[PDB]
């Protein structure tokens, strides 16, 4: 309500694309003090101010035996045991000792993707980045100066995405 | 693509290396081009003749469409009209010119394309330069505000200059007036809007008397949160000593300045000598295979086995790798002469490599 | 329009530069961008000279 | 796990292609043993339609029935004239037209 | 770490297939080549047998494994 | 939330108590004055200022 | 338990023929592509009967 | 080691029709391959439409 | 009822391995266990299927879907088939399935597509998806018409 | 209380996105519509019944007719989203004769 | 949606296939361990 | 290749392919005159399969046969359970598997 | 270069360098597409 | 408590193990299982049962 101690706005996540959907004022955690006197009402307003101070600030400032993949594996290069190879004479029966070659096997097992991505955001980074945002003087500018990110039906490039096509 | 409306136009009304640039074509048709000479000398006849016929007598062109499209595109990139309106207004202007045309009109049109090119460039650089409109609005607001503070004056005017510097130094910031108040948005489509008039009204009473009272949080509730945001936005500005310290306002400014500082700083910080070539490994494996085969199925002596292997080699590769193959053969020879167990092991076990010191 | 005096052999695309040459860079880029759904590739002649 | 990446970049919907998210080793391996050991059908490549600057969200017809504006029937021929009107910011490809 | 040695050699040059070939197909928008191109009440005998022969065999254009056949022109049925 | 239930002839209703916290604080400045401040964390009664 | 195609042919022999003539072995048993299956090819003439 | 099932079959999803359509898509369907008993059902067109 | 009977006797599983060289096979294995080089697949029909009863001599088939999120939704596909020729979904054994011919829900031999008259779409019980005046009849996709002077 | 029609078998419910701070959990039960009154102001003229009131008194007796409960956040993520159930993503309450 | 069809004197069923995305990602981080992540986007497990 | 007999290379059995041992020139000529005088069918282009690291020399089966570990029956359906084993230094393409 | 080529454009029409060819019944083929 | 109790990576709560060996007799029945505790969790044998 008050343009100085405003109820905060809480973002909504779209898991599927990784972008952040529209947000809204928090409407599930409001305190109903409509049956209180000036004392508790001032106390509650001070509490909400403290909460807003916590939010603003937070947001602004805070932004051998390799483990393999959780089960370590040993590593040997000269562990070659069966030195024979079947020439015209020999006939090698069942064999095989699985050993990770130091350079070939391990590096080929831990290479990253060929080219890094460029798109949406995962859940953890969304939680760390999109804290609830406190909007102080709501919509106080001329048309076009409003925060359009809040409306979920608004597309950044093509403005005001017409629902239903 | 390109903002220069001449460039962003001329991509639309133009061929590719036609006789609009006559000099390049005339250079290429005789022999003058050095990148790939004799290209034109060997094209089919028709084409050749046609270019030549074009070259000696050029064909006149009508540039009306080019100029009109240039000015239309300039209007579009300068938010004079919507792109659909651009498609419409192109035809509108074309009809207008076509029903009043004269040499004077063409001259004025060239003048106009020059003017609109310059206008687009100026608008872009001005939008990236600081947005004088915000400065004008801020000066109007400051004229509305009184310039005299009974309790303390140096801090007040220092803060006023700091605010002026802040709005000047960061473009894309907006200063305006919507109701009977002035505001300050840190960015278009951005949060953090400060009620400037209310902030100044609240801060008028805290300038020259909150220095002695900064130690006790008895008057700390007089600071409305909007003014707190206003102070927070000016932490990077108004460096130490601008606002007299030991003052509640000064204390807040110093704390905020120190905090932002650690942050950006931290943020910009962020965050066997010889081994064989695959060809030589192929040669080594072939030598192993051949020597083992001869030694195991023909029973020949190891020296004769090594000799027999050598000959059966592809002459090109044998000559190309004469030194390495020669050294390997000599090493295997002396190994078989001296240490038969080592020779048999090294000739029968894959994954074997020559030990260091063999080099 | 404007009466033109280019040699008719090239002015009618009988023998001369092919489509990706005499067309605009912008139009060529646009046609290549929308080759899939709205094909513009058959609206312009490509001369072939033996 | 979706806690790593968005659910569409994961599960290989709109995002990078197979020749880009796979490790270089596997790409080279598939390019080497393509002839006798297929690996093409065991991965995915998203196909993403362009979002903007193609179609229009405004109301616009897909087909129009043009009543003839004038007829002159004759003992040997029938003549019909149609005022073919192409609205603003629309392009008509005559190949679709028919009588 | 080079796997070129595993590939068939087309003569001093590995036969590395195009990297742009990894499968993707769905219900609509995915089309693959090699389409479904194709007591007699009537005794003609002839064309009949011939037609049966035609029915058991094949022809198209991207069948370019190996060679198209001598002098040339580029054609359709892509 | 999607539920599956066996068919029944009469109309029925699924009651889904959703738990929440529900807290009331009471304060008294002087004789004969009661001031209460309610709360419900995941489904608020609602009051903003 | 060695015949295939519901006819008397060992899966060893069928596998060898398929591998030799179309490389359609280890990765499934799809019908060979038409161009790879000429008139003298193995598949087009293979007729199981019962 | 740990019986974490890898096949999570739903009831809405239909697999038989999906395999039918896939088989149609990637190769010719008129041909017969006896191994999978692969022979698409069809009617004589002169019978459906006289 | 006709007494046709069947009795399975034995079942064995056959697999075929490409005889890869051990070094190369091990390298391929170590490559395919990457966090990134993972295999993925999609069902070719890519569908979700639902079926809805239509009584005898019926001529109208309302279908309602409650509130839903429609991301990535691709489109519709529909057909009509006889109830007698479709088994009960999921249940192991249907004792009423007294039929043995073609099963269009399974083998994909549909033969009733001609019987459809028209289809209507409505979102939020208000707007219509075919759209802003798109078709000739903007409200509803009209498939086939009886006598129509237009 | 969310309604269920005659012979209906699926009762989907949706809740528009909101903060869920300090949430605790769920609890549910089926009641015969004739039993529970209209949760309104005194007289409910369509309430003609005088037995137990399981919505009020606590004598729930229909919990044995639940079959499946599926919980999904943002319509893409199931809540026990780590395969922490034998069935993949459903709180399968009672299994029919299909006793795998 | 409101279909309508010509009358037929036997029960029949409209079948609508709601085109959807149905993908599965398969992982295998050790010997003999399979981990999968199924996903149907327009109608996930909480389907109607 | 070490053991390539030179008579092979001269007779174009293995070694450089047609586009390389020919003089650059003929190559070009050919490329140009493709349309009218073919000349691609008259030179040889050798193809050579790789030797090492593609096939296992040690004794190994091709078509493995797994038997049902356990089987259940019922009046309408029956169940069969197999213990599929894939030893090391192997890869199994499930497409080949078939009951 | 070559002037002896059909010219479909100012640029010449020339095929791939690698165009010269072979097939032995063998199966020394059973090889893939032009693509 | 917020953390250091429950993991976020997937784990299943319940595992079902299929016997590897079985033997019928006139009177007995022997079943053998290969119990596999995960690499980080711990198992209280009291919860297990047949």
Curated annotation (Swiss-Prot), chain A:
Concerning what turns on (or off) its expression, the entry says: Expressed in the late phase of the viral replicative cycle.
The chain residues annotated with the modification Phosphoserine are: 112
Determine if Phosphoprotein is one of this entry's keywords: yes
Annotated site residue numbers, Cleavage: 95-96
Q: Which residues form the propeptide?
A: 64-95
PTM comment: the record says:
Cleaved by the viral protease during virion maturation. May cause the middle segment to be shed from the capsid.
Q: Give GO MF terms, alphabetically.
A: hexon binding
Query: GO CC: one term?
Result: viral capsid
The UniProt keywords, alphabetically, are: Capsid protein, Host nucleus, Late protein, Phosphoprotein, Virion
Cysteine pairs forming cystine bridges in this chain are none
Q: Which Pfam families match?
A: Adeno_PVIII
Fill in the misc note: All late proteins expressed from the major late promoter are produced by alternative splicing and alternative polyadenylation of the same gene giving rise to non-overlapping ORFs. A leader sequence is present in the N-terminus of all these mRNAs and is recognized by the viral shutoff protein to provide expression although conventional translation via ribosome scanning from the cap has been shut off in the host cell.
Record note on quaternary structure: Interacts with the peripentonal hexons as well as the hexons in the facets. Part of a complex composed of the core-capsid bridging protein, the endosome lysis protein VI and the hexon-linking protein VIII; these interactions bridge the virus core to the capsid.
Q: What family, per the record?
A: Belongs to the adenoviridae hexon-linking protein family.
**Name of the featured protein:** Pre-hexon-linking protein VIII
**Which species expresses this protein natively?**
Human adenovirus C serotype 5 (HAdV-5)
Q: What is the lineage of its organism?
A: Viruses, Varidnaviria, Bamfordvirae, Preplasmiviricota, Tectiliviricetes
Name the gene.
Answer: L4
Curated annotation (Swiss-Prot), chain B:
UniProt induction comment? Expressed in the late phase of the viral replicative cycle.
Q: Is Phosphoprotein found in the keyword set? A: yes
UniProt-annotated stretches for the region Disordered? 1-19
Q: Which domain of life is it from?
A: Viruses
Q: Which spans does this entry mark as compositional bias, Polar residues?
A: 9-19
Q: Could you tell me which residues carry Phosphoserine?
A: 220, 272
Localization per record:
Virion; Host nucleus
Region entry Peripentonal hexon-tethering domain, spans: 1-101
The entry's cellular-component GO terms read: host cell nucleus; viral capsid; viral capsid, decoration
UniProt modification remark: Cleaved near the C-terminus by the viral protease during virion maturation to form the mature protein.
Keyword Phosphoprotein carried by entry = yes
Q: Which UniProt keywords apply?
A: Capsid decoration protein, Capsid protein, Host nucleus, Late protein, Phosphoprotein, Viral genome packaging, Viral release from host cell, Virion
The main place the protein resides is virion
| Region Binding to hexon-linking protein, residue ranges | 133-246
User: Which positions does the record annotate as the modified residue Phosphothreonine?
Assistant: 269
Q: Which family does it belong to?
A: Belongs to the adenoviridae hexon-linking protein IIIa family.
In its miscellaneous comment, the UniProt entry states:
All late proteins expressed from the major late promoter are produced by alternative splicing and alternative polyadenylation of the same gene giving rise to non-overlapping ORFs. A leader sequence is present in the N-terminus of all these mRNAs and is recognized by the viral shutoff protein to provide expression although conventional translation via ribosome scanning from the cap has been shut off in the host cell.
Q: How does it assemble?
A: Interacts with hexon proteins; this interaction tethers the peripentonal hexons to hexons situated in the facet. Interacts with the penton protein (via N-terminus). Interacts with packaging protein 3; this interaction is required to promote correct genome packaging.
Q: What is this protein called?
A: Pre-hexon-linking protein IIIa
Q: Which organism is it from?
A: Human adenovirus C serotype 5 (HAdV-5)
Swiss-Prot record, chain K:
Taxonomic superkingdom:
Viruses
Q: Where in the cell is it found?
A: Virion; Host nucleus
| Biological source species | Human adenovirus C serotype 5 (HAdV-5)
Protein name listed in UniProt:
Hexon protein
List the range of the whole protein covered here. Answer: 903 to 950 of 952
Q: Which gene encodes it?
A: L3
- Location of Phosphotyrosine modifications: 38
The text of the family note is: Belongs to the adenoviridae hexon protein family.
Q: Cite any additional comment in the entry.
A: All late proteins expressed from the major late promoter are produced by alternative splicing and alternative polyadenylation of the same gene giving rise to non-overlapping ORFs. A leader sequence is present in the N-terminus of all these mRNAs and is recognized by the viral shutoff protein to provide expression although conventional translation via ribosome scanning from the cap has been shut off in the host cell.
Please describe the quaternary structure of this protein.
Homotrimer. Interacts with the capsid vertex protein; this interaction binds the peripentonal hexons to the neighboring penton base. Interacts with the hexon-linking protein; this interaction tethers the hexons surrounding the penton to those situated in the central plate of the facet. Interacts with the hexon-interlacing protein; this interaction lashes the hexons together. Interacts with host dyneins DYNC1LI1 and DYNC1I2; this interaction might be involved in intracellular microtubule-dependent transport of incoming viral capsid.
Copy out the induction comment: Expressed in the late phase of the viral replicative cycle.
From Swiss-Prot, chain M:
PTM comment for this protein? Ubiquitinated by Nedd4 following partial capsid disassembly; which might play a role in intracellular virus movement during entry.
| Stimuli inducing this protein | Expressed in the late phase of the viral replicative cycle.
Residues forming the propeptide are 1-28
| Positions bearing the site annotation: Cleavage | 28-29
Q: What's the family? A: Belongs to the adenoviridae protein VI family.
Query: What miscellaneous comment appears in this entry?
Result: All late proteins expressed from the major late promoter are produced by alternative splicing and alternative polyadenylation of the same gene giving rise to non-overlapping ORFs. A leader sequence is present in the N-terminus of all these mRNAs and is recognized by the viral shutoff protein to provide expression although conventional translation via ribosome scanning from the cap has been shut off in the host cell.
What is this protein's record name?
A: Pre-protein VI
Species of the source: Human adenovirus C serotype 5
**Whole sequence portion shown:** 6 to 40 of 250
């Amino acid at each position: 309500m008050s343009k100085e101690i405003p109820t905060p706005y809480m973002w909504s996540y779209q898991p599927q694309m990784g972008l952040a959907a529209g947000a809204a004022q928090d409407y599930s955690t409001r305190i109903n003090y409509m049956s209180a006197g000036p004392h508790m009402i001032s106390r509650v307003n001070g509490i909400r101010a403290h909460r807003n101070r916590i939010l603003l600030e937070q947001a602004a400032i805070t932004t051998l035996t390799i483990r393999g993949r959780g089960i370590q594996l040993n590593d040997e290069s000269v562990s070659s045991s069966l030195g024979l190879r079947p020439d015209g004479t020999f006939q090698i029966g069942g064999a095989g000792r699985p050993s990770f070659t130091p350079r070939q096997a391990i590096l080929t097992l831990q290479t990253s993707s060929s080219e890094p991505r460029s798109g949406g955001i995962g859940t953890l980074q969304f939680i760390e980045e999109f804290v609830p945002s406190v909007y102080f003087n709501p919509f106080s500018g001329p048309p076009g100066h409003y925060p359009d990110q809040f409306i979920p039906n608004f597309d950044a490039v093509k403005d005001s995405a017409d629902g239903y096509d | 693509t390109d903002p220069a409306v001449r460039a962003a136009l001329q991509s639309q009304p133009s061929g590719l290396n036609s006789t609009d640039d006559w000099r390049q074509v005339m250079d290429r048709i005789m022999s003058l081009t050095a990148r790939n000479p004799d290209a034109f000398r060997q094209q089919p006849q028709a084409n050749r003749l046609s270019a030549i016929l074009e070259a000696v007598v050029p064909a006149r062109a009508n540039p009306t469409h080019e100029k009109v499209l240039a000015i239309v595109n300039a209007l579009a990139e300068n938010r004079a009209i919507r792109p659909d309106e651009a498609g419409l207004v192109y035809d509108a202007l074309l009809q207008r010119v076509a029903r009043y045309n004269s040499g004077n009109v063409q001259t004025n049109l060239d003048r106009l394309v020059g003017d609109v090119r310059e206008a687009v460039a100026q608008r872009e650089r001005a939008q990236q330069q600081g947005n004088l409109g915000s400065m004008v609005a801020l000066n109007a607001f400051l004229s509305t505000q009184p310039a005299n503070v009974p309790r303390g004056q140096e801090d007040y005017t220092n803060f006023v200059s700091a605010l002026r510097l802040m709005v000047t130094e960061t473009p894309q910031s907006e200063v305006y007036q919507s109701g009977p108040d002035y505001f300050f948005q840190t960015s278009r489509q951005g949060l953090q809007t400060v009620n400037l008039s209310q902030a100044f009204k609240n801060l008028q009473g805290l300038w020259g008397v909150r220095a002695p009272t900064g130690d006790r949080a008895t008057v700390s509730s007089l600071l409305t949160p909007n003014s707190r945001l206003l102070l927070l936005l000016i932490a990077p500005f108004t460096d130490s000593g601008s606002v007299s310290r030991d003052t509640y306002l000064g204390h807040l400014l110093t704390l905020y300045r120190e905090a932002i500082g650690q942050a950006h700083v931290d943020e910009h910080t962020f965050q066997s000598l010889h081994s064989l070539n695959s060809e030589e490994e192929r040669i080594l494996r072939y030598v192993q295979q051949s020597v083992s085969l001869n030694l195991m199925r023909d029973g020949v002596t190891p020296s004769v086995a090594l000799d027999m292997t050598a000959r059966n080699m592809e002459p090109g590769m044998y000559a190309s790798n004469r030194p390495f193959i020669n050294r390997l053969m000599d090493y295997l020879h002396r190994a078989a002469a001296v240490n038969p167990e080592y020779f048999t092991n090294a000739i029968l076990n894959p994954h074997w490599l020559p030990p260091p010191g063999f080099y | 329009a404007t009466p033109s005096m280019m040699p008719q052999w090239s002015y009618m695309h009988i023998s001369g530069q092919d489509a990706s040459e005499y067309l605009s860079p912008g139009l060529v880029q646009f046609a290549r961008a929308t080759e899939t759904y709205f094909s513009l590739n058959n609206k312009f002649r490509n001369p072939t000279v033996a | 796990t979706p806690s790593m990446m968005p659910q569409w970049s994961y599960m290989h919907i709109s995002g990078q292609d197979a020749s880009e998210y796979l490790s270089p080793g596997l790409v080279q391996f598939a390019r080497a043993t393509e002839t006798y050991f297929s690996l093409n059908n065991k991965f995915r490549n998203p196909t993403v339609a362009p979002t903007h600057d193609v179609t229009t969200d405004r109301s616009q017809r897909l087909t129009l029935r043009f009543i003839p504006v004038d007829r002159e029937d004759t003992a040997y021929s029938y003549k019909a004239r149609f005022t073919l009107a192409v609205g603003d910011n629309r392009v008509l490809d005559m190949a679709s037209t028919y009588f | 770490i080079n796997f070129a040695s595993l590939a068939p050699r087309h003569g001093s040059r590995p036969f590395m297939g195009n990297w742009q070939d990894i499968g993707t197909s769905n219900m609509s928008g995915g089309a693959f080549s090699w389409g479904s191109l194709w007591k007699a009440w009537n005794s003609s005998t002839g064309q009949m047998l011939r037609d049966k022969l035609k029915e058991q065999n094949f022809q198209q254009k991207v069948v370019d494994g190996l060679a198209s056949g001598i002098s040339g022109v580029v054609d359709l049925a892509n | 939330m999607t539920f599956e239930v066996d068919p029944m002839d009469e109309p029925t209703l699924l009651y889904v108590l959703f738990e929440v916290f529900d807290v009331v604080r009471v304060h008294r400045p002087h004789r004969g004055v009661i001031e209460t401040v309610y709360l419900r964390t995941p489904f608020s009664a609602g009051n903003a200022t | 338990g060695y015949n295939v195609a519901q006819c008397n042919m060992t899966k060893d022999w069928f596998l060898v023929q398929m591998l030799a003539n179309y490389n359609i072995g280890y990765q499934g048993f799809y019908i060979p592509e038409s161009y790879k299956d000429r008139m003298y090819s193995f598949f087009r003439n293979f007729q199981p009967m019962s | 080691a740990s019986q974490l099932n890898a096949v999570v079959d739903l009831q809405d999803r239909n697999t038989e029709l999906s395999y039918q359509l896939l088989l149609d898509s990637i190769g010719d369907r008129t041909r017969y391959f006896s191994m999978w008993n692969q022979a698409v059902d069809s009617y004589d067109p002169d019978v459906r439409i006289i | 009822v006709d007494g046709a009977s069947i009795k399975f006797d034995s079942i064995c599983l056959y697999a075929t391995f490409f005889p890869m060289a051990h070094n190369t096979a091990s390298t391929l294995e170590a490559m395919l266990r990457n966090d990134t080089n993972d295999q993925s697949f999609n069902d070719y029909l890519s569908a979700a299927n639902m079926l809805y009863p239509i009584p005898a001599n019926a001529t109208n088939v309302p279908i309602s879907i409650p509130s839903r999120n429609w991301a990535a939704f691709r489109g519709w596909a529909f057909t009509r088939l006889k109830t007698k020729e479709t088994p009960s979904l999921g249940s192991g054994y249907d004792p009423y399935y007294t039929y043995s011919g073609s099963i269009p829900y399974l083998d994909g031999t549909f033969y009733l597509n001609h019987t459809f008259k028209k289809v209507a779409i409505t979102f939020d019980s208000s707007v219509s998806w075919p759209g802003n005046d798109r078709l000739l009849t903007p409200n509803e996709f009209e498939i086939k018409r009886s006598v129509d002077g237009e």
